[PDB]
From a paper:
TPX2, however, binds primarily to the minor site of importin-α, thereby offering an opportunity for selectivity. As the transport and mitotic roles of importin-α employ two different sites on the protein, the TPX2–importin-α interaction has potential as an anticancer target, provided selectivity for the minor site over the major site can be achieved.
Having established that the biaryl scaffold appears to be the source of selectivity for the minor site in this series of compounds, the crystal structures and docking results were used to design a variety of compounds to explore the structure–activity relationship (SAR) of various fragment–lysine connectivities. The aim was to minimise the strain around the lysine linkage, allowing the backbone flip and improving potency. X-ray co-crystal structures were solved for all the compounds 14–17 bound to importin-α with resolution in the range of 2.0–2.6 Å showing the resultant changes in lysine position and backbone alignment. The inclusion of a biaryl scaffold in all cases resulted in selectivity for the minor site, and overlay with the original fragment 1 suggested that these remained ‘anchors’ for the Glu396 interaction despite the changes to the lysine.
Author numbering: 72 to 497
The structure:
């Protein structure tokens, strides 16, 4: 029927003066554009078909050509930026917005998906979608008493598009737009479908990526407890964005950080710090590094929850990137912690795995480690145990690693090494 038409025929039919010939060629185009290996998007664009497609969006009298041209356009809009641009340039954005209120759910859904791909392309288009007024009719589609009545795929599409309106930076989305979408986002975050949950979490993790004021608008809606609950999901696609949102939040103030701790976050971290998926373990250790950068009573909760031996663990054996996150966690802990907390850290076994990392050929981790070693001696000098410490470090090959660092490209490293040898050794 409409399968494997040539571009030339599609053009011939869409140009005819026959609504039905056009409908038939438009469907042909959509099937061509829907093929999986190398769909001829640029050939379609070159033939000048986008303006014609955009006009069919307005044919309210012919519902099926609306759907078909919507789907065709959608396929193109899901390609490169240049391709997405051609769709926007054809004037698709207000036309798609008008279709959100289509009586046919298939058509309105298709518009949702298309606005999703356009906003998702980048900041400028995101903000252009918003200016043309997309947010209200998108939100209106979710104004039902119970989200469970909505079609499963329909609801996944809306959540996904909403998350693209939250998605990029430089600039971050308009404050006024974020405040408008957030209440519905809080609600989706409570909906019982794994995909809606994942997408909602991604949205929140976009909105929490930035300055503390941004973090505050989110934290103020009270989602932190639901984020922590989702942190313990079995589904890795829910846990990955939940962990990102949580990690973003603890880069903010001490008070925003305390919210995460109070919600029970720290109880999930023994799993997260030993998680078999390498990126979850990396994210969890980074998150820990921002927590040890906080208050002394916050360091104490890390301590109280038994997470210090997990940090020793990560430092001892992990992906190198995760180990560097572990280094930062320790330098932060040591610089801001009390003497008793630094003493405990050494009692848990921090020194040897710390020294083994001096071997690493990465200049900035070495300074982080040196930074941390110094902070520990400073605790020891308050207790006059600097000597006993020296021996620990010397027993586990720590000095051979420290002495070797003078013969080193960087001399902020050599100067840090230098000082340590004189001040605390013979
Ligand atoms: N109370 C001691 C906190 C240490 C100082 C404090 N530093 C931090 O908060 C911090 C510094 C560095 C990092 C970090 C950097 C690179 C990778 N992973 C973590 C995370 C947090 C500051 N710049 O104000």
């Amino acid at each position: 029927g409409t399968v494997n038409w040539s571009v030339e025929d599609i053009v011939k039919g869409i140009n005819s003066n026959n609504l039905e010939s056009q409908l038939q060629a438009t469907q042909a185009a959509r099937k061509l554009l829907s093929r999986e290996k190398q769909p001829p998007i640029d050939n379609i664009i070159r033939a000048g078909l986008i303006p014609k497609f955009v006009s069919f969006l307005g044919k309210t009298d012919c519902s099926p050509i609306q759907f078909e041209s919507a789907w065709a356009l959608t396929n193109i809009a899901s390609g490169t930026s240049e391709q997405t641009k051609a769709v926007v340039d054809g004037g698709a954005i207000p036309a798609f917005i008008s279709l959100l209120a289509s009586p046919h759910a298939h058509i309105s859904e298709q518009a949702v998906w298309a606005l999703g791909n356009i906003a998702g392309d980048g900041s400028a288009f995101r903000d252009l979608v918003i200016k043309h007024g997309a947010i209200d009719p998108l939100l209106a589609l979710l104004a039902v008493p119970d989200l469970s009545t909505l079609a499963c795929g329909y609801l996944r599409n809306l959540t996904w598009t909403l998350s693209n309106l939250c998605r990029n930076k430089n600039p971050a989305p308009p404050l006024d737009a974020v405040e408008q979408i957030l209440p519905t986002l809080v609600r989706l975050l409570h909906h019982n479908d794994p995909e809606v949950l994942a997408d909602s979490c991604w949205a929140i993790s976009y909105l929490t990526d930035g300055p503390n004021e941004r973090i505050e608008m989110v934290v103020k809606k009270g989602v932190v407890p639901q984020l922590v609950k989702l942190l313990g999901a079995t589904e890795l696609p829910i846990v990955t964005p939940a962990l990102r949102a949580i990690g973003n939040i603890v880069t903010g103030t001490d008070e925003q950080t305390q919210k995460v701790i109070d919600a029970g976050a720290l109880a999930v971290f023994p799993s997260l710090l030993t998680n078999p998926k390498t990126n979850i373990q990396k994210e969890a250790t980074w998150t820990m590094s921002n927590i040890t950068a906080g208050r002394q009573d916050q360091i104490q909760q890390v301590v109280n929850h038994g997470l210090v031996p997990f940090l020793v663990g990560v430092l001892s054996k992990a992906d190198f990137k995760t180990q560097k996150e572990a280094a930062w966690a320790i330098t932060n802990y040591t610089s801001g912690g009390t003497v008793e907390q630094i003493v405990y850290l050494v009692h848990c076994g921090i020194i040897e795995p710390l020294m083994n990392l001096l071997s690493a050929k990465d200049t900035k981790i070495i300074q982080v480690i040196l930074d941390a070693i110094s902070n520990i001696f400073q605790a020891a000098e308050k207790l006059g145990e600097t000597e006993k410490l020296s021996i620990m470090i010397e027993e586990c090959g720590g000095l051979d690693k420290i002495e070797a660092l003078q013969r080193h490209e960087n001399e902020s490293v050599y100067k840090a090494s230098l000082n340590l040898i004189e001040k605390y050794f013979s």
